[PDB]
Amino acid sequence: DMRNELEEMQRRADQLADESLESTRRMLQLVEESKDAGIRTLVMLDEQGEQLERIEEGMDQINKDMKEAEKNLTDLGK
């Protein structure tokens, strides 16, 4: 009558982490810095676009003025 039976106990392997808290924090800090740099680039790019738009009008005005002056001088000369 040496017929034995058993029961079982369970253990849980550690969840997936303990490497997600050293590279993670550095990743977040770098992401924040990149976000700030992107915001600054946004602002600078908008300012540059405004300045180019401003330049356009003066360019067109000088072109028109020179063309009209040349035509007038030619007309009077002949």
Binding site: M2, R3, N4, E5, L6
Partner: protein
Amino acid sequence: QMGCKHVKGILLYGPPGCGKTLLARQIGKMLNAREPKVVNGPEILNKYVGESEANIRKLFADAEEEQRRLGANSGLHIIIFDE
């Protein structure tokens, strides 16, 4: 053509130390069989339910699988029981 099956086992008896395992191994090696499985009777017993039967059952798995795969063109497997 005759339709005759092969003998399935033999028994060897005599005084100890007279060369029975030698003869068994030589018979196995001569027929181009695979490496034999040598077992000892007293070492199979266990004190849990369903453990000795598992040990007895585990020796035929390779032959079963090989026959299920290759059908009638399989090799020859040998099992040796001591004591």
